[PDB]
Coordinates of C-alpha atoms and ligand atoms in Angstrom, one line a residue:
X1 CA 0.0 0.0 0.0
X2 CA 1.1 3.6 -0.1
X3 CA 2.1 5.6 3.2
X4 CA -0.1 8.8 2.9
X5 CA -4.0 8.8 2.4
X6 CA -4.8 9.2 -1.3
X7 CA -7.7 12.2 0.0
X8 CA -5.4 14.9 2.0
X9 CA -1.9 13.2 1.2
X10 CA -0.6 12.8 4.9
X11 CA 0.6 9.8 7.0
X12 CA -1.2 8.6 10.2
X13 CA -3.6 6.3 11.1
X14 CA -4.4 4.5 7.5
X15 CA -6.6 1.8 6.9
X16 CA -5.5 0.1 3.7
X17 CA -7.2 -1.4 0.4
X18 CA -7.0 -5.0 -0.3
X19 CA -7.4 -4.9 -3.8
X20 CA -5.1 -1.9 -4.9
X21 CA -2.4 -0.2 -3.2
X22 CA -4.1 3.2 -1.9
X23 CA -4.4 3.5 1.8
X24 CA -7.2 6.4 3.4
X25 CA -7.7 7.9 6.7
X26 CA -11.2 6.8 8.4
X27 CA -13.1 10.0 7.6
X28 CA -11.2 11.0 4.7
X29 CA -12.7 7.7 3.0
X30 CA -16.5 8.3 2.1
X31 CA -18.4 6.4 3.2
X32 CA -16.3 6.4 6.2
X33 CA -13.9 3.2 6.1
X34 CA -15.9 0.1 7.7
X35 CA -15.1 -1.7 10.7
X36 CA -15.0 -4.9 9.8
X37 CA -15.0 -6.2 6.0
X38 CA -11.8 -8.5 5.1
X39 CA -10.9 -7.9 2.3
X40 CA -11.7 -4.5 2.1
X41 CA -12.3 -2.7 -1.3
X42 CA -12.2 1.1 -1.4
X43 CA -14.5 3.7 -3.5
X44 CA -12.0 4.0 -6.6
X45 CA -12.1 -0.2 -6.6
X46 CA -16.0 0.3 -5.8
X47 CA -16.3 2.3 -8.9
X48 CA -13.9 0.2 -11.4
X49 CA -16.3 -2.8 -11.0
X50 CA -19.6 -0.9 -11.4
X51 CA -17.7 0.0 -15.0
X52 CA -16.5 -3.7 -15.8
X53 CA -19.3 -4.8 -15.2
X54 CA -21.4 -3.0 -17.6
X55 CA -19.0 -1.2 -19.9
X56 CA -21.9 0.7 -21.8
X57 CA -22.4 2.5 -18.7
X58 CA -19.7 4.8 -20.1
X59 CA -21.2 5.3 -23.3
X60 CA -22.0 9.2 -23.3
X61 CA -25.1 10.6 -21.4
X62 CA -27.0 13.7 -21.4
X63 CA -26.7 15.7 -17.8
X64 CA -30.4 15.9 -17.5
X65 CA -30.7 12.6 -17.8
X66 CA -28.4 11.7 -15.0
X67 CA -29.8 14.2 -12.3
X68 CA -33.4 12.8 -12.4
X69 CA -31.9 9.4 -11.5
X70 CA -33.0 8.0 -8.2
X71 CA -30.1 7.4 -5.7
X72 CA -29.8 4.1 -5.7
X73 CA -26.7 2.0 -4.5
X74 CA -25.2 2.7 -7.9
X75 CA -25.8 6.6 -8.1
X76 CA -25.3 6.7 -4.6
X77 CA -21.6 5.6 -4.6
X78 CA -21.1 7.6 -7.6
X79 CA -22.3 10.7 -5.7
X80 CA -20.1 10.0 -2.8
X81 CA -16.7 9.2 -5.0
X82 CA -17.5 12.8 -6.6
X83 CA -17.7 14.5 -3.8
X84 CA -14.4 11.9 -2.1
X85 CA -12.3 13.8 -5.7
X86 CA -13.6 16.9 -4.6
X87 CA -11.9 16.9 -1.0
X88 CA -8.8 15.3 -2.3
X89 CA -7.6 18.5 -4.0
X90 CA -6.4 21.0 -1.6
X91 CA -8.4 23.8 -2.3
X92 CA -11.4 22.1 -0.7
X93 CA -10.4 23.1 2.6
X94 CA -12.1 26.7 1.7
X95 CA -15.3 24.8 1.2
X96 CA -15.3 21.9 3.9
X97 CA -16.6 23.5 7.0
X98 CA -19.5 26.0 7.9
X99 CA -18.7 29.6 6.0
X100 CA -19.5 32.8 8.2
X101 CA -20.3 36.2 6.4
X102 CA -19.5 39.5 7.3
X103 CA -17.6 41.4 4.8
X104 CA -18.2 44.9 4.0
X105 CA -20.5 45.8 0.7
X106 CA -21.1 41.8 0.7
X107 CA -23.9 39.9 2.1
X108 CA -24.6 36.7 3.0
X109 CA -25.8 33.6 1.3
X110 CA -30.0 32.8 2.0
X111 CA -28.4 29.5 2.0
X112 CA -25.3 28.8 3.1
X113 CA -23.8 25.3 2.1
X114 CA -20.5 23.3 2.8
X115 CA -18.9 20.1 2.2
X116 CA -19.4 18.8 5.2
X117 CA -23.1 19.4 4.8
X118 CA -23.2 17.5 1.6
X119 CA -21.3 14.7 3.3
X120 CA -23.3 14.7 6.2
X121 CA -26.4 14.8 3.8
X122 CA -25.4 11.7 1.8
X123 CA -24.6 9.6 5.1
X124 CA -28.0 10.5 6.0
X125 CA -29.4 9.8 2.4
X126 CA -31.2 12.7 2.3
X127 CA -30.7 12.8 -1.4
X128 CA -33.4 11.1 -3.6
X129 CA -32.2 12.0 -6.6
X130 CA -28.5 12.7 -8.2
X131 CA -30.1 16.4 -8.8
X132 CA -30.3 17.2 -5.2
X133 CA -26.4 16.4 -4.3
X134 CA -25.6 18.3 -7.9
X135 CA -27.6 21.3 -6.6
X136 CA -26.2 21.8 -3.2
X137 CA -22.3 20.8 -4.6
X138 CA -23.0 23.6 -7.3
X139 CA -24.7 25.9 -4.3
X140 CA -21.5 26.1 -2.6
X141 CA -19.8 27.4 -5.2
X142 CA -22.0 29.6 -6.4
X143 CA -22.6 31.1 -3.2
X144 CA -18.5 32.1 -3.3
X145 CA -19.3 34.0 -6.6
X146 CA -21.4 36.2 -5.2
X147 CA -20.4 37.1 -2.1
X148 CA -16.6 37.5 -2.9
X149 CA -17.5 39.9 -5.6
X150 CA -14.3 41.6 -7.2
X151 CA -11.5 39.9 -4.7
X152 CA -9.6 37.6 -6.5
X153 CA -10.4 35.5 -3.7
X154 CA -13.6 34.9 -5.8
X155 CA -10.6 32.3 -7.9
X156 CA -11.0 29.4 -5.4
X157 CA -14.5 29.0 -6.2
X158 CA -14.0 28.9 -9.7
X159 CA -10.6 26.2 -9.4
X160 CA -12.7 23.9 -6.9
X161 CA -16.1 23.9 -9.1
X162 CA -13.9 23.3 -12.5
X163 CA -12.1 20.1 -10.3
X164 CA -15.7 19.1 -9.0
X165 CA -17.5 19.5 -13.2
X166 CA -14.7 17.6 -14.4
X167 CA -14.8 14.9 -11.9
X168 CA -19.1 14.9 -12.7
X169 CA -18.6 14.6 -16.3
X170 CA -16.0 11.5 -16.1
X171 CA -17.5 9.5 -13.3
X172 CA -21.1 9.9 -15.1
X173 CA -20.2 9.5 -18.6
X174 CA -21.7 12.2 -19.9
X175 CA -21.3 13.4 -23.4
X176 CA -18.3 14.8 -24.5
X177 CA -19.6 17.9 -26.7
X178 CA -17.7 21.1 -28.4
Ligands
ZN1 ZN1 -6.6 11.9 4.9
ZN2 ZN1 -8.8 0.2 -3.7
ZN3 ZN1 -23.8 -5.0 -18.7

């Protein structure tokens, strides 16, 4: 296995795959790693097999298409592998706990949102439909936009959503277009 979690890229406590050789802290892992379970699989292994098992599931798809899909098992680890590539780039850590607002000539969001949140909302399974963990991951960053305004801070917002589209587009398949 490696020596660093494959989410924030430090060592420490690691609980290691068995079939490939990334290793995760506990709650860097989503779902959060299982106590028991030997072997032990992790979410990027998860995902392979959902794809080798039926390889025209990354034939191209339209984006409406995929949000009205109920969450089940399937959609469900999808969602939470998404979100799992969204924490493992750095920038996330702007994004991963509740936001506070009080910035002159700004105002806050009517509804704030954070990772943490949308993690806390898929252990919960809150979400029906892929739409619902779509619309609050896109809230977050959205919610940046506007209340950063003109400070360049407003550029983390922009670099996390591109890293979180990106990630969408690949892990559902959906159709490459001009
Ligand atoms: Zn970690
Ligand atoms: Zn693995
Ligand atoms: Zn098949």
């Amino acid at each position: 296995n490696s020596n660093i979690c494959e989410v924030c890229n430090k060592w420490g406590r690691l609980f290691c795959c068995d079939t490939c050789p990334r290793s995760f802290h506990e709650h860097c892992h989503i779902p959060s790693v299982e106590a028991n379970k030997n072997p032990w699989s992790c979410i990027f292994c998860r995902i392979k097999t959902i794809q080798e098992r039926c390889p025209e599931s990354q034939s191209g798809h339209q984006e409406s298409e995929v949000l009205m899909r109920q969450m089940l098992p399937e959609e469900q680890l999808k969602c939470e592998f998404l979100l799992l590539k969204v924490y493992c780039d750095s920038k996330s850590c702007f994004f991963a706990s509740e936001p506070y607002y009080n910035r002159e000539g700004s105002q806050g969001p009517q509804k704030p949102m954070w990772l943490n949140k949308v993690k806390t909302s898929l252990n919960e399974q809150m979400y029906t439909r892929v739409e619902g963990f779509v619309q609050d991951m896109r809230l977050i960053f959205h919610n940046h936009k506007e209340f950063y305004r003109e400070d360049k801070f407003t550029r983390l917002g922009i670099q996390v959503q591109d890293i979180f589209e990106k990630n969408f587009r690949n892990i559902f398949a959906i159709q490459e277009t001009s």
